[PDB]
Design a protein around this ligand. Sequence first.
Ligand SMILES: *[C@@H]1O[C@H](CO)[C@@H](O[C@@H]2O[C@H](CO)[C@@H](O)[C@H](O)[C@H]2NC(C)=O)[C@H](O)[C@H]1NC(C)=O
Ligand SMILES: *[C@@H]1O[C@H](CO)[C@@H](O[C@@H]2O[C@H](CO)[C@@H](O)[C@H](O)[C@H]2NC(C)=O)[C@H](O)[C@H]1NC(C)=O
Ligand SMILES: *[C@@H]1O[C@H](CO)[C@@H](O)[C@H](O)[C@H]1NC(C)=O
Ligand SMILES: *[C@@H]1O[C@H](CO)[C@@H](O)[C@H](O)[C@H]1NC(C)=O
Ligand SMILES: *[C@@H]1O[C@H](CO)[C@@H](O)[C@H](O)[C@H]1NC(C)=O
Ligand SMILES: *[C@@H]1O[C@H](CO)[C@@H](O)[C@H](O)[C@H]1NC(C)=O
Ligand SMILES: *[C@@H]1O[C@H](CO)[C@@H](O)[C@H](O)[C@H]1NC(C)=O
Ligand SMILES: *[C@@H]1O[C@H](CO)[C@@H](O)[C@H](O)[C@H]1NC(C)=O
Lengths: 166, 318, 214
Amino acid sequence: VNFNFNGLTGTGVLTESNKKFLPFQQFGRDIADTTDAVRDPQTLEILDITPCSFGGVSVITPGTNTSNQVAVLYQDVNCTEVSNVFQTRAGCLIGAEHVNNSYECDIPIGAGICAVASQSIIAYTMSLGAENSVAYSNNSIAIPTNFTISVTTEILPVSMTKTSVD
Amino acid sequence: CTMYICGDSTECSNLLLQYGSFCTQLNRALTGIAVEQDKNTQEVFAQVKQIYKTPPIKDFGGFNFSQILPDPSKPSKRSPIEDLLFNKVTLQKFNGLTVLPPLLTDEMIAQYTSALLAGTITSGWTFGAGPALQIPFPMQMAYRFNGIGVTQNVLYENQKLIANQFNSAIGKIQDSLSSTPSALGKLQDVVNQNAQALNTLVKQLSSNFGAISSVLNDILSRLDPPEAEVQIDRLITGRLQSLQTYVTQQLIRAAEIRASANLAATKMSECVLGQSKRVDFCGKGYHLMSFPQSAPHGVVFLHVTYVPAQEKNFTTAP
Amino acid sequence: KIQDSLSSTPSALGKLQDVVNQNAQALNTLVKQLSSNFGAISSVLNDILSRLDPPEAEVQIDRLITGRLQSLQTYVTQQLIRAAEIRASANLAATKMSECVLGQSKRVDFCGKGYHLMSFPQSAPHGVVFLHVTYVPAQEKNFTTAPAICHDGKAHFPREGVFVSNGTHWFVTQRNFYEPQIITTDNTFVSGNCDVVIGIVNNTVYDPLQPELD
Ligand SMILES: *[C@@H]1O[C@H](CO)[C@@H](O[C@@H]2O[C@H](CO)[C@@H](O)[C@H](O)[C@H]2NC(C)=O)[C@H](O)[C@H]1NC(C)=O
Ligand SMILES: *[C@@H]1O[C@H](CO)[C@@H](O[C@@H]2O[C@H](CO)[C@@H](O)[C@H](O)[C@H]2NC(C)=O)[C@H](O)[C@H]1NC(C)=O
Ligand SMILES: *[C@@H]1O[C@H](CO)[C@@H](O)[C@H](O)[C@H]1NC(C)=O
Ligand SMILES: *[C@@H]1O[C@H](CO)[C@@H](O)[C@H](O)[C@H]1NC(C)=O
Ligand SMILES: *[C@@H]1O[C@H](CO)[C@@H](O)[C@H](O)[C@H]1NC(C)=O
Ligand SMILES: *[C@@H]1O[C@H](CO)[C@@H](O)[C@H](O)[C@H]1NC(C)=O
Ligand SMILES: *[C@@H]1O[C@H](CO)[C@@H](O)[C@H](O)[C@H]1NC(C)=O
Ligand SMILES: *[C@@H]1O[C@H](CO)[C@@H](O)[C@H](O)[C@H]1NC(C)=O
């Protein structure tokens, strides 16, 4: 709601509170100099003001070279207010199906969840790698019997275009 | 940039729009920092292609790792030391500024440190170079002794003393971290600096910057547009300059954290994954082995080193 | 395989394409800022000079000056930070070139995954590509071990390698490649006795003098 309390105006959700205002104070502010609660007139009660939910909107897309299907992530609003909808600790992702089995992370979303496969966009908890255990004992050693020689490529930038502005 | 500088005002939004791309370049800078922070965590912790697991029987030749291995009885499978670190550093988003979660959660980071520690315990450095080859831990430590110019027979003849000294030093580590404050200052300072930067950025909203009033709605609601527009433009310019200062400071601080993260990843690779001959790179003394532990926004290395003790003078000849 | 890998896996050169893209994006926004008014009557400086008298054109020009100078300062600051990042990367590349191409590095994972053998430099636009040739151990075999061998009461330790058994016979082998050798006095050394080490098996150690004198 758009409120106006004795000249202090703003937008937010007004809710009941348990903050004991003293008889002479009319509104209270949090750290950082912003209003946390206010005392209503006519009825003398303490209302907490929490800004109504807002947040960035992110688009999950495989790419125009693969499919035109996209998923939408609402980062810090709940979506239980304004085709599958899955709530994650990073926000609620709509359009991606939640699959219980883990895979290697492809498109990072946040809070351990990443998200195209099997003709649709899926969302899942990222795997950290194959699970294995080493046969540890107090009298067993594994020694290789055959080298393989591998070549890896590591690419490092060294310079940038020497631009100049007059 | 739009909600922070101007907010819910279209009359104001139209003036913010005349500054071009400043808001898209500040969102670009902040997204760049946010992405590199996840790259930092991935490079420092995700150095193992597979998740290794320790055996259920802790027959490590007398070496006690119960203080660095995860505790299965705890709600988040943390080791005692890591639990102490999460309980020692202690850590606002209503004016259009939000904080995104990291890609790697604390549980997942702890699982990576558990994989690294189980790998180093059960296979030495072999899991870093290729496949994890099991080796008895006393034989592993005997080779690590051989790597610093002490013949492996010194460990085997003194195995009980070495195990007792290792266990005592590890036990001392928790008491030191729990009793000497400022020990975690390198992480408390970064958390404090980021909290202070956000608190200052929000506090700048109360400043006038020369305008008659800091709150846009009362000036817009009391002054006529042809004259209020100037006060709005002045406040927008001051607030935009404040945001630019915040972003620049964050870019420099991000570069500092990136350098530290690169150093941490190098230390993890050359101290935890292997054995370093680089003097004083992996703690004071001749390096034997290292143990990674996670911490809020950082990593703690337990460097186990060999230090010469009582010495005697002898006459020599080449 | 390297040629096919880089020719078939996109984003493989991402570390250089991202720097080129970041510089192009910064320069593109710097140019695009010329379309902004910053409150001036028009973004084209020449049209205001062609329509306004100096005493009033000066205020519009001063506003345009302030907006473009602060935009340029933002570009320069971001370029200084990006230059510091590229400089750090170039210093790392020079260190890698020296300690991987010019020598052989013993510091693990600094010159690729595996035990470093040698490296190859390759130039690339605004960057360098290193081909690291590394030794990677493969298929391992289990063996039973012991830290020392008791012979006639004396404790023998390997000078290099470890003692392994195939179940029935004990051999000495280097740790990084299975190559069983008979335990002798010339691959093993003596220190102490077996009654001190908690891990010991009783085997025989062959002294080449035994067959040379018989
Ligand atoms: C302000 O005036 C209103 C209306 O006169 C008061 O509301 C009344 O309060 C009495 C006492 O509690 C109740 O018995 C009535 O039923 C209330 N009427 C209504 C319509 O709510 C209100 O309490 C006054 N506030 C003050 C004096 O602080
Ligand atoms: C070590 O591995 C190499 C391959 O990595 C083996 O060479 C292969 O040998 C088989 C049978 O002799 C051939 O059919 C393959 O074509 C060979 N491949 C290559 C690339 O040469 C080699 O035999 C292995 N040695 C041991 C002792 O295991
Ligand atoms: C968001 O949704 C979840 C599940 O519906 C609920 O537990 C939580 O309280 C909600 N949070 C807010 C702020 O509405
Ligand atoms: C290791 O030490 C802890 C106490 O610090 C003890 O509870 C635990 O049983 C010990 N483990 C072994 C295997 O002795
Ligand atoms: C060694 O023995 C263990 C016994 O459980 C087995 O799991 C492991 O695969 C063996 N190693 C190899 C290289 O086969
Ligand atoms: C172990 O190796 C020796 C030497 O080749 C051989 O004589 C013996 O039969 C082998 N034993 C087993 C169980 O493989
Ligand atoms: C290896 O571990 C087993 C487990 O009980 C034990 O019985 C045996 O004595 C140990 N051997 C050595 C050499 O430590
Ligand atoms: C090795 O030999 C000694 C005497 O020669 C004996 O006392 C000892 O028990 C033997 N080792 C084992 C494991 O039985």
